[PDB]
Symmetry: D2
Subunit: 283 residues, 4 copies
């Protein structure tokens, strides 16, 4: 198995994300290397190969992959934090909306309200396009031991391809699972923020808070805990905060509840120690 | 006055948008040339120059400019349509939020409600970041004659640099002007839609409908006309419609009113005849 | 069986409402006698008896009974109208909240939302005290023939004690029956309006519209038909209308929907012909 | 000046409420006599007179007057409590809606919103009938000294006809006065609760909370203090509480805020010591 493979588009090669991450990652000490160095280090590694084999890797595949890597770096450490701690919450990585709907994490009685809304809107000629945040912080009251035994072998130290697959499929254990209070928050990450990315997060944050409010209405849940939506990147600056901490759109139309932010808090995550700090603060 | 000028960034040249548009535009028949041909034709024109002078023009300036040109093409034709018709609505081009707030088009008693909201939110540590749609369709009940005399010389036929300046500053005549019913709709345009652009329009559309709903609440306006938000590009496809006609975010939280779309209708505008069709349909 | 019987409270006698109504009613032509004459005529009839037997009947029993009689007069004619017509709606008399909850007419999935609300409120130390309107206009799509055969013998002409019992227990056929659209309206009646009675109807009307709005929210029913609440008395005057057509209380807090009246229309019902006019207009 | 005077309706006499209250009140020690004894004692006093003069006083005038007396008993003690204390709130007696609108206590910018609502509703053929609670607890930040000097001579001990007039006209000092936070609560009293009276208070309580919510919406006041609505009678029992502590009608339609009671607390006030206890608890 090689790290890159020709996409048949001429000199075009596609990156084998997982293999490349594991092959490169085995060679470094994640605990002493900041995430940004691993990513660029990973970009170079792949370039050498493309040059040996005489090929070309477009920055689109690189950009697609940078996200994968950044998320796996965070996702693995989150599990180690879980293994090493006594918390009731586990940070689970979510697949794309193309193939999965984060709403299905909720019990079916709750998700059906959302399906009911999508159907009624379609009849009025309106769509309901939702996206899945990168991670969901799920309340695992009761199944702590089960998951600890299940996820015992996960770590950067014993990094393997199977580790990546687990991080990527752990969500399957939480389908038709959560009551309204079980999903505590969502966390979406970006290597770096640019105008387009700040926009995505603000919009998604707003949308999650709107849907949550829709569910609180259907179930008539008075004074519920509410959900939080967090954002993180390898580097954050004041200019990023302006656009991310804008009002959740539904709050502009209702004076009855305290105004909510689309994004509740933004975190800088460029290392394993940053993951722990963020997690200790979010849980 | 030349069409390009060195940005001092080495071989870097900046495009003089307005001059280039006028110089090139004088040479073609806008009535027989579809907008996409004028834009590419305009890209080439500028390339020749850069090559004669030995220089480099980044696609960022080109991309910045493509929007300018596309908007001026639409903006000028809208005024001709106005001059040639007997409608009470005029399509006015809006400047960027960096230097202008589209809310100031409303009478000061109305815009103050928005300023009041921004201030109360800031005290709760929440921002209110708004953007300005490209065009506003304004009800000019009464001042039709005045504007017709004022804008008599505007046309593609007698295209000049002063024409561009007028199209770009006409909005100054409508500050602290509109009652809630005077702004009929907004129209935001893109040369072509890409994922990032479909997102921008959907979000902005939602936000405009949320603010409008906020104003209807403050003034307690029962059963108002409502505002529409339209989108247009030189080419539109079914895939674009999926994301643009998604629900306005505030409708997800309220069963009391009919569900609204973030974008009410999308138009294909690749010619002067397309502008007229869209305008006859929107007015 | 006598029309009055000693309540053991000394000279105190209690009126046997049903017997007295039937005994007296058999002697008159309801089709030519206005309701107010039957009521006073019925008051006298009972007085003669009390005098023969040497007894006393307090106006409280009379007042309790006047309502019974007025309602039976309306209730019987409504059934005749049903028997004689081809409508899909039947006017059903409702028992007191002491022993029945009009919400149970709705399917159990709907009434449970109301039970859920009562329970959550009690936990916040708030009560939900509701009252039952006098009549409910129910959509009997499908069971027209069944009911016509069942209610064939009901009329003023063949008035009997069993007729009264049927009018009073017909509601039992509609428990756990209605979908949100099946109950078209409610109708509460009073012999005459006094300040206290105008207040009762206004409050009840408001409450029914609030609960209906609560159900429309739980089920997320967009643009539903809505419910009407009507009032009727043997004589109505402009002064009565002032207080009855006041806003339904929940409309004061929401600009999103058209303002609703607590009482939609008030009818004068002092005869069989008045019942038909009201019914033809309400159905 | 006599305590009763012929209403020209034959043997009919009308009670001169104020004189009778003062004449009788001068003879007793309000501090040792429970309110119910003063009221019955006052009923007898008036009967003696009617008998000496040979006349008849209907219980309607008595019932009208019982309220007056009960309110003056509470109103005078409230002022003594004010004179004797260092509170920023004063309990002011309100006149009937026939001649006064409690909404005018608010600054004109606030009351105009209510006038605006009444006008828009009338255009949709809906009325807005409001009633005035008996007392308003007003925040007198700043004018404590002024009022203390003004109201220095008010007491049961130096009871006079002018004392009654002051208690009844003190409200004139607070017209176009209050900001949304200045009216802390309302208090409506009844000698005793009967079904009709429990209904009145529940409805009025609901209506006040609906209007307050309407004002919070117009001004976009986030997380305001809110208003309370209290009830009091010479004797209260568990059966009274059932109906009075029912939900404020607007709360049934909105899950966004905590459920509010139409009546927040019910007090037993049969003495001067009961007034103080209630006031110390409400302020």
């Amino acid at each position: 198995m090689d790290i890159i493979s020709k996409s048949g588009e001429g000199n075009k090669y596609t990156i084998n994300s997982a293999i490349a991450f594991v092959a490169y990652a085995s060679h470094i000490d994640i605990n002493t290397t900041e995430f940004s160095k691993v990513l660029s280090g990973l970009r170079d590694f792949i370039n050498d190969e493309a040059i040996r084999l005489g090929g070309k890797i477009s920055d689109g595949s690189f950009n697609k992959c940078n996200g994968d890597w950044y998320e796996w770096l965070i996702g693995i450490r989150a599990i180690e934090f879980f293994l090493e701690s006594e918390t009731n919450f586990i940070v689970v990585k979510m697949p794309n909306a193309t193939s999965f709907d984060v709403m299905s994490i909720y019990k079916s009685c709750l998700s059906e309200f959302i399906y009911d809304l999508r159907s009624k809107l379609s009849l009025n000629n309106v769509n309901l396009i939702t996206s899945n945040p990168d991670f969901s912080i799920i309340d695992i009251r009761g199944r702590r031991e089960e998951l600890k035994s299940m996820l015992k072998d996960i770590s950067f130290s014993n990094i393997s391809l199977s580790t990546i697959s687990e991080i990527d499929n752990l969500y399957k254990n939480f389908i038709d699972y959560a009551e309204l209070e079980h999903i505590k928050s969502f966390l979406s990450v970006k290597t770096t923020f640019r105008p387009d990315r700040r926009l995505q997060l603000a919009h998604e944050g707003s949308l999650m808070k709107a849907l949550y409010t829709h569910l609180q209405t259907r179930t008539w849940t008075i004074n519920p805990t509410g959900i939080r939506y967090y954002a993180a990147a390898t580097s954050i600056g004041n200019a990023d905060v302006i656009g991310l901490k804008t009002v959740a759109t539904h709050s502009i139309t209702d004076v009855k509840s305290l105004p909510q932010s689309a994004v509740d808090e933004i975190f800088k995550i460029n290392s394993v120690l940053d993951v722990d700090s963020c997690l200790s603060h979010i849980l």
